[PDB]
């Protein structure tokens, strides 16, 4: 295994990664960062 810097938040009873990959990946470029979808009302 290898040590890696990342943030881990405990919610409820489960330790989950809290990844917001917009900086390392999808950056300064031409790819659609998902999670910005649209809704129709």
């Amino acid at each position: 295994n290898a040590r890696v810097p990342a943030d881990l938040v405990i919610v409820g009873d489960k330790l989950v990664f809290l990844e917001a990959l917009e900086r390392r990946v999808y950056q300064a470029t031409r790819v659609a960062y998902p999670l910005i979808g649209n809704i129709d009302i």
Partner: protein
């Protein structure tokens, strides 16, 4: 009266550009940078396009 009166204005009259080197780097560092509310979505509306 010849010894004391040019050590205080070439000590204070040759450090004027030592009153010169902070106000010409914010007259284009404060005359090449305007206003704010739009930066803030300079990180909420443009990575891909």
């Amino acid at each position: 009266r010849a010894i004391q009166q040019m050590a205080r204005n070439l000590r204070t009259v040759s450090d004027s550009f030592e009153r010169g080197t902070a106000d010409q780097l914010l007259g284009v560092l404060l005359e090449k940078a305007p206003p704010l509310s739009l930066l803030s979505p300079i990180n909420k509306f443009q990575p891909e396009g």
